[PDB]
Every structure is written in structure tokens, then in C-alpha cells.
Amino acid sequence: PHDPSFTPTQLAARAAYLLRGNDLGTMTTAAPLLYPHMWSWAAAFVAIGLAPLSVERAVVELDTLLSAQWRNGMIPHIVFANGVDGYFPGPARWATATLADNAPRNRLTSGITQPPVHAIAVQRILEHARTRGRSTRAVAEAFLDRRWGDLMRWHRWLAECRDRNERGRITLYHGWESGMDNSPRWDSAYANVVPGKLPEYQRADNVIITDPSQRPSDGEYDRYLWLLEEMKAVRYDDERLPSVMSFQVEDVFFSAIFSVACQVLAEIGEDYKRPHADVKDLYLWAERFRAGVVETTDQRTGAARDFDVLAEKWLVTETAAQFAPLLCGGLPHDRERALLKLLEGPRFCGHPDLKYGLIPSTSPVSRDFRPREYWRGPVWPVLTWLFSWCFARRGWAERARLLRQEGLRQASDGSFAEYYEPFTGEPLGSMQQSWTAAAVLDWLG
Amino acid sequence: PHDPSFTPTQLAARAAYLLRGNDLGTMTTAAPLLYPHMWSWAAAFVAIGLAPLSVERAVVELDTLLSAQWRNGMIPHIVFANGVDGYFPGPARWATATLADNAPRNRLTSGITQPPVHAIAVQRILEHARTRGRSTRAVAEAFLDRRWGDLMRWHRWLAECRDRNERGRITLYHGWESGMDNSPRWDSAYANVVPGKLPEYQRADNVIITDPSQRPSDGEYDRYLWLLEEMKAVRYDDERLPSVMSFQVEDVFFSAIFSVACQVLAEIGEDYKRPHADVKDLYLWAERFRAGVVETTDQRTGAARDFDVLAEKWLVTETAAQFAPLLCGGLPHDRERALLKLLEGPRFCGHPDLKYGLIPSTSPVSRDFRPREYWRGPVWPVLTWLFSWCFARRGWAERARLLRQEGLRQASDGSFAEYYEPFTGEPLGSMQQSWTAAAVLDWLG
Amino acid sequence: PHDPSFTPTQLAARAAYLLRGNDLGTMTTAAPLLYPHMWSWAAAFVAIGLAPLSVERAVVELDTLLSAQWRNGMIPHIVFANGVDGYFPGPARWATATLADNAPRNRLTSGITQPPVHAIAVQRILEHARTRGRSTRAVAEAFLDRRWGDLMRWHRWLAECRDRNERGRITLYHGWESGMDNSPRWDSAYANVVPGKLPEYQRADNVIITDPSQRPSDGEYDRYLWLLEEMKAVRYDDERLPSVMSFQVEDVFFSAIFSVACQVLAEIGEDYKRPHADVKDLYLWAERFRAGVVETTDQRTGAARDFDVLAEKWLVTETAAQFAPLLCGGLPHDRERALLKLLEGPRFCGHPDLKYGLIPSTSPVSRDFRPREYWRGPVWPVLTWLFSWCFARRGWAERARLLRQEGLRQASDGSFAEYYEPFTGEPLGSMQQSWTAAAVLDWLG
Amino acid sequence: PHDPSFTPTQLAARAAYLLRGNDLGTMTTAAPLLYPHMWSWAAAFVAIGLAPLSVERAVVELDTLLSAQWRNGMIPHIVFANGVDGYFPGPARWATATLADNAPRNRLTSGITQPPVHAIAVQRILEHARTRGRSTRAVAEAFLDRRWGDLMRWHRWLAECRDRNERGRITLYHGWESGMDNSPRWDSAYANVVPGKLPEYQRADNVIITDPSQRPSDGEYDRYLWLLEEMKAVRYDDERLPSVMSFQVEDVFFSAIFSVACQVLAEIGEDYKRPHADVKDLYLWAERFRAGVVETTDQRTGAARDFDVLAEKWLVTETAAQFAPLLCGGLPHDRERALLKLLEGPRFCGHPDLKYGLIPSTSPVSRDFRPREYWRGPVWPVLTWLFSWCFARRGWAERARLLRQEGLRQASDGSFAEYYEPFTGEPLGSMQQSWTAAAVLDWLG
Predict the structure, then answer these.
(1) Which residues of B touch A49 (CB under 8 A)?
(2) Are A358 and A403 spatial neighbours (Cβ–Cβ below 8 Å)?
(3) How many other CB atoms sit within 10 Å of the CB of residue B145?
(4) Nearest residue to A113 via CA among A240, A258, A211
(5) Catalytic site residue C181?
(6) Which CATH class is domain D1-445?
(7) How close, in Å, is residue D441 to chain C by CA atoms?
(8) Chains near C (3 or more Cβ pairs under 8 Å)
(9) How far, in Å, CA of D354 to CA of D164, rounded?
(10) Cα angle at C264 between C259 and C269, to 5 degrees?
(11) Distance, C-alpha C26 to centroid of its chain
(12) Signed CA dihedral, C32, C34, C38, C42: sign only
């Protein structure tokens, strides 16, 4: 027909329909077939999407994730659904059940972590619950009573075990932990990953998404899977990873998210009278990781750089992660204006060929840009949501509104795509992606 | 908080969330616990609610119902879910699998029928599909190819087997077939039902809805269950029911719905080039049942009367079924103006104590009125939807709009109640009622 | 930027801002500069646009128009604003104040008429007023008390003086009376208009709209002005016009509007207890003009034809006026289905190059089609509104809704254009056109 | 009827209709009859309401106000419409044209000032203009070119002449300059104002608002008018006012607005490349007045106090002005949490009897509270708007959203009242108040 777009009520209805369709009972899959398990930072965004629909079920999603938390406080990036195949690497390949002393009992999980967006989801649940009356507030408050300690142990694990030199940046041992699997950010670190005798495997992801231009290459997957072998060889021991891992990077976007999450969780702790020692620690980490992000920044543009710990070199790339300081604050006034100018100008949101005024995952003017290839170019609704929410929290009400308006216009086809081609708007990756529906529901719920 | 109501997008999202939550896979329950099976006219309204969400799944709902159609064309009023308890009378009590020569193989069903709203759901599916493009139109058109014959056999069974004297009104052998179980319409016919040796039973419905003021009495249930015994004794044989049934009424509201449904299905048959003989028969029945409804009407107010076939007497009651002629048309101009005056005045929608400008199931000024008791007074969103849709089809655009606006205001608490107290707006009956969510979604989808 | 469209709330605000900006006090101009006076059928649409904003001011608009009614009941098509120039032909050219015995005192008007959409405006005012409470209902009821007789005299002058032979169609003496000045409908009748010594003149309309492709030609204006000379020569006397006018046509679209308007006014008359004889006359005229419209129609396609009274021949053209019978009803069932098939097919709303699913003023496949030239092709929001309102009144709820949706999409640029290029959507004619803002306000009010 | 509320589109339409109706040509009256002139801070809010409708007309509103700026930079609080009477005190009473050396030529104005919300209006105009494309941006940029210097002179006159001692707070010589004429804030200072021989007068305000409970008392008006006599006696000379005025107070709410406005104007200055010295002065003033506001605050609760310069004492009252520090920032973290707890608790937004979750002008638990009496208790939409905008700018997105939602709920009756009874929601003061329509338009525009 003359316009395939849905009205706001039709789109909200379809988004909620999707999220309930991806519910296995106590966990929501990240997508129906491509990602048929619970991913950690996806579960946070799913809980945000569920909060306008059912505070009780949003709380269940976070409870299920936190029940898979490791003994040392790490939240693993995948919690596998029982008896579910069609995703590789599955639990057999990770072997955390047999090898990892800290793995949970009676959950199957991966052995790496992912960004700490969870406190943001807790804030959204509390904000919805407070509009819904007493029994709903009681549900959310009982969740805090039950899980405050687990959330603290999660933030403490990050601060103590992935920032062992108190530099205020999080070290990753796998690009998957960044959430941006094949970002140009990691190319030079991955070039220093040399697989040994890698056990044979067959990919599953590109059986579902068959267009090779939309997913990482076989050579990249070989490196992803080899890092798993290096972790397995030391039984996922935190104390041994710095000595054996071929990939060790400080992720400045993860670090900025953690700064925000600490500040958010500290404000929740004050509001709900959690222990003062915990609130103090959270504000201290918020400050430390804010400073750690600012320390990376370009002196002209304010752009944030990742750091290769093995090579001891700043990683300079032109991706959306450069805008990490906008999330957590801390740049001097003049440099933050330069960074906003970069965000809005012809290298990113202002590029003249963009269909929507949204942030591409890699700058279209970078030689690394590929308009279809996962994190090397496409526009991701999940990132649009996170930037809009963080911008509103900075006080940039109009910038946040414009991102939401363009993100809703992009989503109004109802495909709920994982990511979109930046110039044509073609939906790419998995359709029926839960956190894309969640973004739409929060923007409308 | 200061206002518990939801915005239109929040309400649409919650309605879709509910309908997906009630999906068992290929059938949607009418409610989560009170009605944990598929009801026939509920399934039509569920398909209307699904159409803005998934034309494919809306079609599946009707396919599942039609797969339970009896050999003689009857659509039974319940299709039981496999292995589901907590509803009485269940399939053991009906014993149609063992006793009824016309019962379907490999579905379990009841042995009575319910109103033919199904063609209306087919129209809504086609209207949505035509806005959605080629592959979606193909899905809806393939449904017509597959099920046109079954829909014809359903309408033919009603016309030939429940109007055996071609009076243009449908005979019922159970008040449950009217959809209005305990309506005052049936009280005098039920007083002539005398149970014999009624096999012991324990109700299940009032274990879920425990407030006795909201459900029928034990004495009424004894009569409902005795009629089942009379049908079982003749093995549900259509030819034997007139000779043995203690309850035989002509239902003028069912008759008007059938008139509309025949006209709707005839227009679909013309549009999609179905056999001309079928379209002709449908228009003939549309006309016959329109005239049959008009024949019942009060010469002053236009109000339609049911007919007790055993007592040979017009049943004069003050319920929403009086407005049957407004659905199908056919009254002379002056009498239809009088009937609209009755609808809008102080006996119904204009009653000064009503919270919303909606049609109570029984007039608040009738001595039969009970403000909590199922069909004896409460406002039913399903009836608001049906009247609004039929009124729009009469060309009464503003009257239809006002019913929709008030029905949405009533529903904006998000309880999706089965029915509502007419004066206080208190939600009553089952919460999470699928056809209440469907009404909201159609009004917004 | 990326999306120059307005939200529904922004668009409704800017539509109301425009209408109040075109208010001279007691009359609203049809456009700020091109049409700086009150046009008769524009005033009806303006009152519809004002009814959601102020029932009182909506009533004032019709009061002002009726205060300019001629002594014989004719509503003239222009009521000039005092002292305003820049429109031609102005009141000096018409000279009705000096020549026309029936012209109003102390108003200046044109000497021809225009379609009777006024009763539709009265219906919308009453519907709004009934939602606004006792004081607002009193305003609208006082208007009926004060103006019912003038409305009757208007309808009676059309029925008796423009249908002298009781054929059930309205005769026009000028194409301006049709509202479709340069429609292909009138080309063969204008070809027989041979101007004599025409007093010199300078056009004003193409000083404001300078693009010559958007307005009638100079040769066309010469014929328009020559017909004025013929009417002036007989002092605008109804009895003498049939003997002298070079242009005499029966307008089937005007006739169908009149049928609808008579039926609408009759129902208002019944509801507000107006004299029985008036109501009976209105129903008589509604039927007469419904039959008159049907008599013009092609027996296979249903398309309605105009009639050239001087040439005694049916005018066969491919414009939107062919769909006149859809407005008033009366066609046999098969013929109306055929006419709907024409409307929805590739000659009109289904043409593959149309930007919107809307009714072009002339079929894009006609040899007469010109995509920019006034009534020879462009899409007119005022027609979209009239068709969608009449369709909803026929019971065609989905058809009406689709026209409304597409009309709002087209209007969402906020130009409030007089008409739009059918392929590109370019706004054409005057911007800030009052009845385009009124359509938008009604569709959202 | 059952729901006298308007839909968002109807409400936006009626708000725009009202604003255009209050337009005299180049100035908008604050209300049709009670306030038939241009008020200074009302004009800022009016320009905000016009920006979604016409950036050009929004700019004209500020141009007209600035054309009335005094020679020393003061923006007077009233610009009188030519020839308009029915407001008292009018221009003959002020006699600024004859007495005040700095009064404008060929404009008539008052002789006192009002809060500097103008920069906020400029920000909203620019944000709208940037969404509307090149021509509209040029309009708004031309305004900056033409008026940047006048805006600087306005801020510099406040900073240098109303903060002579560089305390970072604005001194007022009349309670009218606060915008909160009869606030309890000023009661102890007015108690020391002893009128001498006051030239006789007749109030006009209580001929329009006759209910005495809604307006200030006669004794209060005598003091207001006596202060005028004191200013006239010294010819409105800035240098002489501190020696003669019986009323001299530092207004912490005005001061916080000024801080915000300086920061807003500085950011505009940086974005549009205005002189570096101006931007540096604006940042200096923003900090000075932020610190000045913080210096007034209770160390436990954060509540800000006004200061009586003549009595040399802090004015401790329980009004909405206590929340001044929330607008401008600067409080220590613990103190701001305490102040938010006061705002949200049972003394203000959390009071159990409030109809809406909105900020009453005086705490309902204060002995000074009067639920109908102007600034002594009622809820003012203009304050709701200002607080919600400032809160969003602080990053408090949910707090801002809740105020907007409740303000729209309250405004959904369409009265556009000046203020509302806090318990019953009764509209009070003038109906058709321009800045109430502006708030609604901004919240929906």
C-alpha cells in the first residue's frame, strides 16, 4: 500500500505482542531463532520493555538473570535455555559447568560478561511501579530487598576484578563482552590473536542469517572461538586471565555505561535506604570510571579511545563508542561541545545520505564503514535508545527527543529489526529482536 | 496515584500482551482460568483482536475453530484444550465424543452452538490484510479458499436446522447458545425446565469467581446441566431435539446477528468471486432473518421480543437484546427512531446514574436488573464493540464513535474485565478477558 | 530536515491557528489573498472546521452567510467583505446591488449560487454541541429556531427554480455554480459559449497564483465573464434566464449533494420538532434528486453523467463527479458495486502513480487530465472530506477511514493547500486554504 | 455529558485558536479582558506557545516587547496596547511617558520590571526553527542578529542595577515585579508599607473577576498603588529608588530564573558565535546568581528564602518559591535531596487532598494558605510549565514528565484558566489565559 507504516497504537501493540511471543516462561529470548537464549544486557533492555506491561514480569526477567550470577559476582553474558539448540557456541562448547569453579549450580551459562545496563532497567521498573500504586510498588521494593546485594556484588566484581589497577576503565578478555562483536574498535587487537589447535566447529548463526554481508566472517569467528579455548585452559580463573589471554582491551563505552549505572544504582540505594557503605562505594566507582573515560579523550574533539592493554596503545577508530563521554559526563565544557559537534555533523548523525537522523555504529566516512555488516556501520535501535535515555539524563531534552522521534520513525515499519541499513533503512539482522521492541515500548509506554 | 488510567499506546500494548498471554499455540483461551478453552463466538472476537497484530495468527484462530466443526455444519460453542481441567462442564460431561454421530474426530467439543459472529471477524481480517500488502493478502485469500465451504455449511446448518419452519428466527435448545447465559430473557422458559435425576456435580466457575453476586445461582446451573442430559439422551440428534427438549426459544438477537453475518459473508463472496449460488443463498437468508426479527417488534417502540416455542408466547423483557433490529435494519423509519430513542434515553444509555454512556445488559429501571449479576445488568465491552461496529455499518457514524469513545474510557483502567458494574465502573467477572482486549485493540489497531 | 511532517497535535494546532487568522470578524475568507471573501460552500466547510473550536463562532459563520440570502431564497456563491479588493470579478462587475431585485440590502454578493452543503455543516455543529453540554446545545438550538426557515427557503428555491421540470437535477447557468470551475465536465458546453463585446478586464487571480499551469486560461475567463453579461442583461431574473443563457447544464454532483442535504435536513427537522410539512418536503426532494441522479447513470458502470440542456445531450467525462451516486445512494446493487470498482481501480484511487490513495478530480488516464490545472486532475482535500463523510454515512466505514487516513497523510506537510499534485504531492493553488484546514480539524476534532 | 474533557488534538486546536484570538496584531494580550495588554513575562511564554505555530510570529512577539525596552536596558512589565482601557493602573497612573527619562518613545509602558524568562523563549524558538528548515532558521537567526544586544542590555541592567552589591540576588521595589503579586512571601514587607495621601482610584480587576476570594484585597491594592507614588516622586530614577522605596526585597525565585536565563543565553551565544565578552559575562552572572540563590537556603531542607532589605531579615514562608534552587542548580547533593523530598511530600505535591500531582503556589499546610486567592494557594499552569522545563534541563526526565502529564490532565477541560483550585480543580481567575494555552501548546507542540 501507499504507506507500510503503523500508527503509534498499532506499533505499541505489535511490540508487546512480540515480547510476549519471545517469552519462554521466566526468560525472554533475545530473538526467536538467531538468539534463542537470554543475553545479559539484552535482558536489561527486555525488562525495560516489560515494565509498562507487567512490573511483576519485568522483575522476573532480572531475577532469572541474577539467579545465574557467578559466585564471584560476574553476570555471564548468556543464560542458556534448557534443551534449546540452534545457537553456537552452546553450553557444551563453553564447558563452564564442568570447568568454572564460580559457575552457578543448576543454570547453564557462558563464561564471559557484558555491559552493566542492569541498574538502568531497575530505575525504569521503579519509575513505572511508582505510577501504578501500592501493590505494584511493593513488588518492585521486594525485588530490591531480594537483589540489592547481588547487584552490589555485580558492580563490585567489575570494579575490583576488571579494573585491578584502579584505572577507572573495564578490561575485556573477549570482544563479545563489549556487546559490539565485530566493531572496528577491536580489529587491531584481534589481529594479535593467533589460534592454535582449534577444535572443529560449524557456525549456526549464518544458517539463520544467510546473507554473508550482514554477519562476521569465518576468520573472525575462528578468533572468537579461540579465546574461549584460552579461558577454558585456565578454568575461567580471574587470577589467571591476565597471564594467558591473547585479547586484553579497556573498553571505554562499557566503562562509561558502568559510570552511569553506578550513579543510578547509588541514587536508588539512597531512595530505598540501602546500606550507606554501598551507596558510598557506588558513588566512588561512578566518579572513578567517569575520570577513566575522560582520560582517554582526544584533546581536540573529546572523542573517547579504547586501550589495548597488551600492545599498550590507544585504539583510535571512528565508531559510536567515541561518544562514551556524552553518557557519563566529565569532559570540560569546550571539549564536550566539540564532541557534540562531531556527533551531530557530517561524520555521524548529520551525514547527508542517512535516511534517519540517527547514530551509525561506525562513521559512514570511515574506511572501516560497511553499511550492512553488523557493528561496522548499521544503525542499532538499542544504541538509539541508550543514547536518548542518557542524553535526557544529561538535561539535553531536545537532543533526546530528536533521537526518540527518529528512532520511532525508523521502527514504524514494525519489523523490530536488530539493526538497519543507514542509507536505505532496510531492516537487517534478525527480525523480531526483543530489545528493539523494548525500545519502542519504552519510547511509547 | 492521581489517575490509574493508561494512555492509548500503553493500553494497546497491554491488550496485545494479554491476548498473546492467553494463546495456547493454535487457540486462545477466553480467559486465563475461568474459561480455559476456546469458545466459538469468543474466538471470532479474538480473531478481530489478532488481526492488527498478525493476520496469519488471526487466520489460525478461525482455522482451529472450523477444524472442530461438526459433520452437519454446526460450530460447537466450546472447543476444549487438550488436557485442561478447571472448567465445568468438561468434555466428559458432554460425552459428545462417544454419543454424537456428527462430532469431529480428534477434537473434543461441546454439543450446542453459539452466535454466528464469525463472518464479521472474516471481514475484519480481510480489511487488515488489504492494508498490509501482497503476501498478507495471499494469506487471507488462501484462508477463504480453504474455509469458504465450511463457513457456508455453518450458515446453512443454522438456516436449515435451527429455522426448520423458515420463520427467519433461530431456535435455541439451551440458554448458553444465546451467549447471554442468565439473561432475564430466558427466565420464564427456564421456569418450565424440571430436572429429573441429575447426575451429581460440583461447580468450578464459582471457585474462581467466588463473589456469589457475580455469577448464576446453583438452581440455574441445575437447569443448565439438565438440558445437557436431555440432549445426551437423544445423542445430540437434530431431528430428535424438538420432541424432547424442555427449552425451545427463538432468539431474536442471535437472529439479527445471523442476518448481518449473512449479508457480510455474501459481500465477501462477491468480492472474492465465490460461487454465485452461495452468494444468492446468503442474501436470501440475510433478508429472511431481517424480516423475522422485524416481525417480533413492539408496534410502539420497535423493541424486539424473543419467542418461547413451547409456550407459544412472546417473551417481553427489558434487556439489550431488544435492540436487535438496530443491528440488522428493516424497521420502518418511525419505529426505528422510537427504538433509538429507547436506546439513548433514561432506560438504557441515558440513565442518570451510569458511569459511562454505554448499554447495560438489562435496563437499570427493570425489576430484573441486578448491577453485578452477569447478564442481568452489567455493561459488557463485547456488546459495546458489536453495537458500535454494527452502528457504523448502518451509517450512524457519530453514534458508533460515541460508543467506542465511552468503551475505551471504561477500558482505560487496563483490567480487561469480562463486564463492569454500570454505576460504579467496578470491573467484574474474569479479569484478563480475551474479547475485552480484542475490542480495545480493534478500536485502536 | 529528515521529516518535514507535523504530528497530529501540531497539525490540529496549525489548522486552528490558520482558521482564526482568516477570520475577518463575522466571516472567514476562503484564503488570505486569492479568495479574500466568503464563498458559500466554503463557509459551510469553514463552519464544520470551527465546530470543534467554538460552536458559537461556527453558528456565526452560517448566520453571516444566511444574512446574505436573496429574497427568493437563493444563497449567492460570494458574499464580499466590505471594502476588500484584489479579487476579480468583484461586486462592481456583478452589479447585483443595482440590477438584481432579489439581492440583499446592506450586503454585497455575487449573482449565482453554489452547492447546498450547508445542512451537512448544521449536522456537524449539532453533533459537536450535543457533546458540550446544556449551554452549548442552547446556542445550536437557537440557531435552528432562527434559521430553519431560511434553510427551507434555500432548499425550496433550488427544488422549484433550478428544477423547474421536476427532473430531480439542478440546472446551472455558470460553471462557477458547480464549484469545479474548469472541470472537463463543462468543456463541450463552454465550447458553445461565444462572447460578444465583452467589457475589458484584468484578471487578479493569476497575479497571486502566477504559475499559468495551475489556473484556468484567459480564453476560459472570457467565457466566464461573458455569462455574467448575459445574466446582467436580464437583471438576474430567474424567469428570464432560461431564455437568454448560453450555458445551461444539469449538474449531477450538485444534485447528489442536494439529495444528501435534504435527507440530512429532514432528520434534523424530525429531531428538533420542526413543522411536519417541511420535513415531508425535504424527504420528497431527497428522493426526487436521488432518483434524478440515478437516472443519469451508465447501466453497466454506474457512472453518473451531466446533461447539456441546450444541446440536449449527456455529457460523458471521466471526473470525480461520476461518483455522485455514491454520495446519495439509490443505485441498484450490481450497478453500485461496478461504480465502486471504478472508484477503487486504476482509473482513479488505484492508479499506480498516485502518491496517496485519494480521488483525483479528473481520471489520470483521461485525455483531459492535467496534473496541475485546478479541477482537471489535482487532488482536492475538500472533495476527500466530502467523499469520506458521505461514505461513512453510507455505512462504508473502512472506505471512509482510508480516505481520511490518506487525506491526513497528504495534509501533514502543514501547507493547507487548495489542491495537490496527484503524483508528486506538491501543494498547489493557494496555501492557507480555509476549507483544507477545516477538513483536517474535522478529521482530528 | 459523561466526560467534558478534550482529546489532545482538540485541546491543541483550541489552545492555538485562543492564542490567535488574543493577538492584537503585533502583541498578544495576557487575557481578553482582565489583562488586555502585553505583560513582559507573559510575552515570553506566549512566544513559546507561538513557536510551534509560526516562528515568524513568535519572533514578532519578542520584537514588540524589546521595542519597549527602556534606555537603561530595563524591560518594563507592561506594554500597553494603544487606546485600550479597562485595566488599572493604566498608563496615566504610571505617568512614565512624562516622568521617566529612560522610558521608550512612542510606546507606553509601566515603570517596573518582571522576571527574565525571555532567554528561555528564545531557546524554544531556536529549537523549533532548527526542525523547520532553512528559511525558518534564517528568521530566528535574523532575530538574534537584531536583538542579541538588547537581550544583553536587559541581563546587564538586572545584574548591575538590581544587584548593586553583587550579592547574586535581584532586588525588587514592588511585589508586582515578582510575578506573584499577593504571595505570602511579601506579607511582612508589605506590612511596613504605610500609604500617605493616596490619590483616589477605582479598581478594574474585580469588576471582571467579581468573586472577592480570588483577587487581592482593597488594603493590598492601596499598598501596591502607594509604591507607585513613591517611584513617581523620584521620576523612576534607578539611583534614587534605594533612598525612597518603602519596599525593598531580594527575590530568590526571580534570581534563580535569572541564573537559568543567563546560562541559556550564554549557550545560545556560543552556538551562534556572539561576542566572547558577552558569553563570558553571561556565564559569570549565571554562576553569581546560582551562588546567591544557594546562599539563601536552609542548611537542612534546602528551602530558599527571600530577604527583606529594609528589615535586614530572611523571609521564611512556605510557598513554591522555596524551590528556586531546583531551577538553577548549585545545592550540595544532600541538601538538594532534602529539597526534593519537601517538594514531593505532604506539604506540596504529595498533599493527600490535591486533585493533581502539581505544585500549589502556597503549601496547603501553611497558615497562609487560601485555596482560591491568587498566589496564596492555587495551582498555576505557568509555574507547572516552568518547573517541568527546568526539571528536564536538570536531567530529571521522569519528574518533568509527571508534571507535564498532570498539567495536561488539569488543562483538559479547555478553560485555559489562569489558576486552578488545588483540591477541586475548579478553574479560577481569568479564563482564556494566554500563557496557559502556551503551556499546553508547548507540552503538545
Answers:
(1) none
(2) yes
(3) 10
(4) A258
(5) yes
(6) mainly alpha
(7) 8
(8) A, B, D
(9) 41
(10) 125
(11) 21
(12) negative
Instruction: Give residue A80's identity as a one-letter amino acid code.
Output: F
* Chain C residue nearest residue A357, CA to CA: C2
CB C378 within 8 A of CB C360: yes
Give the E-state strand segments of A18-116 in sequence order: 38-39, 78-79
Q: Classify the C-alpha dihedral C141-C143-C146-C147 as positive or negative.
A: negative
Task: State the DSSP H helix or E strand holding residue B442, giving kind and residue range, or none if neither.
Answer: helix B434-444
Is A181 in the active site? yes
Nine cell digits for residue B89: 462442564
Q: Which residues, listed in sequence order, are joined to residue D79 by a DSSP beta bridge? A: D38, D109
Strands (E) across D224-370 are located at: 249-251, 306-308, 313-315
Q: Are B96 and B110 in contact (CB under 8 A)?
A: yes
Residue showing cell 446574505: C68
Distance CA(C335)–CA(B157), nearest Å, equals: 32
Supply the DSSP symbol for D401.
H
Method used experimentally: X-ray
Phi first, then psi, for residue C144 (nearest 5°) are -60, -45
Q: Which residues are within 8 A (CB) of D378 and not within 5 positions of it... i.e. 6 or more apart? A: D360, D361, D371, D372, D419, D420, D421, D422, D428, D429
Question: Residue B91, preceding bond cis, omega within 30 degrees?
Answer: no
Rg of chain D over all Cα atoms, to the nearest angstrom: 20
Contact C397 B394 (CB under 8 A): no
**What cell does A208 get?**
539463520
Neighbour subunits, D (≥3 Cβ pairs < 8 A) = A, B, C
Size of interface B-D (CB pairs under 8 A): 18
C13's grid cell: 494546532
Domain boundaries, chain B: 1-445
C213: number of Cβ within 10 Å = 11
Three cell numbers at B275? 460461487
The Cα C349–Cα C364 span in angstroms is: 10
Resolution in A: 1.8
Q: Residue B81 contacts by C-beta under 8 Å, 6 or more apart in sequence?
A: B24, B27, B29, B36, B37, B38
Alpha-carbon span D100 to A141, nearest angstrom:
63
The residues, any chain, with a CB within 8 Å of residue C33's CB and separated by 6 or more, are C86, C208, C430
**Nearest-angstrom CA–CA distance, D294 and D303:** 9
H or E element at residue A420: strand A419-420
Please give the Cα distance from C412 to A136 (Å, whole number): 40
Amino acid of residue D55: V
CB pairs under 8 A between C and D: 71
Q: Tell me which of D398, D401, D402 to substitute to probe the interface with A (most A C-beta atoms closer than 10 Å).
A: D398
What torsion, rounded to 10 degrees, do the Cα atoms A390, A393, A397, A402 define? 10
Which cell numbers in the block locate residue B255? 437472529
Q: Count of residues for chain D?
A: 445
Do A394 and D397 lie within an 8 Å CB cutoff?
Answer: no
Q: Which whole-number Å values give the CA distances from B175 to B94, B181, B192, B243, in the listed order? A: 16, 5, 13, 18
Beta strands in D131-272 (DSSP E): 170-172, 249-251
Q: Which residue has the cell 488594603?
A: D219
**Contact status, residue C349 vs residue C402, Cβ threshold 8 Å:** no
* Rounded distance between C-alpha atoms, residue C236 and residue C222, angstroms: 19
SS3 per residue for C179-196: CCCCCHHHHHHHCCCCCC
* Residue written as grid cell 430513542: B341
Q: Which cell numbers hold the place of D1?
A: 455529558
Amino acid making up residue C80: F
Strand partners, C79: C38, C109
3-state secondary structure (DSSP) of residue B177: helix
Amino acid making up residue D124: R
3 state DSSP class of D332: coil
C-alpha cell at B5: 488510567
The crossing angle, in degrees rounded to 10, of helices C397-411 and B397-411 is 80
- Are the C-beta atoms of B23 and A16 separated by less than 8 Å? no
